[PDB]
Write a protein that binds this ligand. Structure first.
Ligand SMILES: Nc1nc2c(ncn2[C@@H]2O[C@H](COP(=O)(O)OP(=O)(O)OP(=O)(O)O)[C@@H](O)[C@H]2O)c(=O)[nH]1
Ligand SMILES: [Mg+2]
Ligand code: NA
Length: 473
């Protein structure tokens, strides 16, 4: 009836680029300007955005960043608070491809809320580290070994050890206009980062590159001296490098048919009013495999016990910052599509007394109705971690935060396997056990060769201690 095989063959190959950096770096601005350069923002829509920007703080706002800072609360505050996911598909990209651009907040409060988890949730092929090269800003942004830029590097430099894939880091030396493309300054900043990346974080030349730019003026983003690229610069533009990365990503082995279906619930809303049969609208990021309408699924909550059996009523494209068609129904969802998935669930019990609570970070899988997918609910969690630079050792009984997929939970360090050591130390590779502190909470873990289960351990103050993976066995 339906050719599952054919749908996968006509599915464009996606590349995901994740933008990272401190607040005020210019991530939202640059990324808004990029979208404009790719003709994803109409002239009419643009003029409306300048008007909005006129009514806001002229110290914080411009017409490009308001494209990404599109919530009422972010516009009044003047900085990003929520991660944005934009999928681009047009004739400026390689054929049969999509470019996913992800914005993340830099302000430390919302960085700790969303950004670290975005790295683990969306599993980007490319990191884009945006840096403010304006005078005094750069010097202020590297205070000690735990500055916010190094905290980013303490994660992305060490994820997915043993490779099978290689890292791709683009460092955007931004706001070059505010320094009139000071050659010796840009070279200095580049020299400094190059050393740290190589000596402290073990990056190799092929894995990264520097690109000077101005996200506001659009200098060197794509294709009498302002909005100019100086004569001495002979490197590539930002988008040219993005293009190549998407293109080289084309030659990637696609194992979708083999993969089991796994999806992460990014957002959930129960249609009102509630009834004997209820309909839940889920925003789902597909982690692996595929899902088609009419199939039976299982929703597993972070609330330790709850599990819901339901049927996929319909699926739609998720609402995006760019204009898309959310009216039409989709037959098939594929890794890494983000879809609206309407789930039909029949209440076993009285529907008024007991109402289900489906939260972000919960997973959805195909129903194991009565090769079956192994699913674990863990309170005591074994972790295969590796440390590097550590200011202070981490003793047993320490309280930590465990980042996994879209969730972060307080845990207690309860055991260090294979040794009588009483603490985690610098530059080690350990097997460790942590315990969920929160009552009636359990971490959902899928044991499969097609799921990474990367994690990050931080202190309560959100200082990265180690990177690792859930050890299921
Ligand atoms: N002169 C100049 N200013 C820029 C440039 N890019 C961004 N800005 C300004 O820098 C400020 C911060 O820009 P944002 O786009 O909000 O940077 P951000 O990294 O997204 O900030 P967060 O969302 O808080 O992480 C804004 O007031 C912009 O007008 C640039 O290329 N040149
Ligand atoms: Mg922003
Ligand atoms: Na900002």
């Amino acid at each position: 009836s339906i050719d599952i095989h054919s749908f996968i063959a006509t599915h464009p190959l996606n590349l995901t680029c994740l933008f990272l950096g401190d607040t005020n770096a210019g991530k939202s601005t640059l990324l808004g300007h990029l979208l404009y350069d790719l003709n994803e923002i109409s002239m009419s829509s643009m003029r409306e955005l300048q008007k909005k920007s006129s009514n806001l703080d002229p110290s914080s706002s411009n017409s490009f960043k308001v494209i990404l800072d599109n919530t009422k609360t972010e516009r009044e505050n003047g900085f990003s608070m929520f991660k944005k996911v934009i999928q681009v598909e047009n004739d400026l990209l390689p054929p049969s491809s999509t470019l996913t651009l992800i914005d993340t907040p830099g302000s430390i409060k919302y960085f700790n809320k969303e950004t670290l988890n975005s790295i683990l949730t969306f599993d980007p092929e490319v990191y884009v580290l945006v840096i403010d090269c304006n005078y005094d800003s750069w010097e202020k942004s590297l205070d000690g070994p735990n500055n916010q830029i190094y905290e980013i590097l303490k994660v992305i430099s060490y994820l997915n050890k043993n490779s099978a894939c290689k890292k791709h880091l683009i460092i955007l030396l931004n706001k070059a206009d505010l320094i009139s493309w000071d050659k010796h300054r840009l070279e200095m900043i580049q020299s400094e980062l190059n050393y740290v990346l190589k000596e402290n974080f073990q990056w190799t030349d092929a894995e990264f590159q520097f690109i000077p730019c101005s996200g506001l003026l659009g200098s060197n983003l794509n294709k009498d001296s302002i909005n100019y690229v100086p004569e001495w610069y002979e490197g590539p533009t930002f988008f040219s490098q993005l293009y190549l990365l998407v293109e080289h990503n084309m030659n990637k082995i696609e194992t979708t048919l083999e993969e089991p279906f796994v999806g992460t619930i990014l957002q959930s809303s129960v249609l009102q009013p509630i009834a004997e049969i209820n309909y839940v609208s889920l925003k789902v990021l597909i982690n692996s495999g595929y899902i088609q309408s009419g199939q039976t699924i299982e929703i597993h909550t972070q609330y330790e016990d709850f599990h819901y059996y339901g049927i996929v009523s319909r699926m739609k494209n998720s609402k995006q910052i760019l204009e898309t068609n959310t009216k039409n129904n989709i037959s098939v969802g594929l890794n890494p599509d983000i879809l609206e998935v309407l789930v039909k669930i029949h209440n076993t019990e009285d529907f008024t007394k007991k109402q289900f609570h489906i939260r972000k970070g919960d997973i959805i899988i195909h129903s194991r109705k009565t090769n079956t997918l192994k699913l674990l609910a863990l309170r005591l969690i074994k972790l295969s971690i590796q440390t590097h630079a550590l200011s202070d050792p981490v003793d047993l009984g320490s309280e930590l935060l465990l980042y996994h997929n879209l969730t972060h939970n307080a845990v207690k360090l309860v055991k260090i396997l294979g040794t009588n050591d009483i603490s985690i130390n610098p530059n080690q590779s350990l097997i460790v056990e942590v315990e969920i502190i929160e009552p009636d909470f359990a971490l959902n873990v899928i044991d499969s060769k097609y799921i990474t289960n990367n994690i990050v351990l931080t202190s309560i103050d959100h200082k990265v201690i180690a990177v690792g993976r859930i050890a299921c066995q």
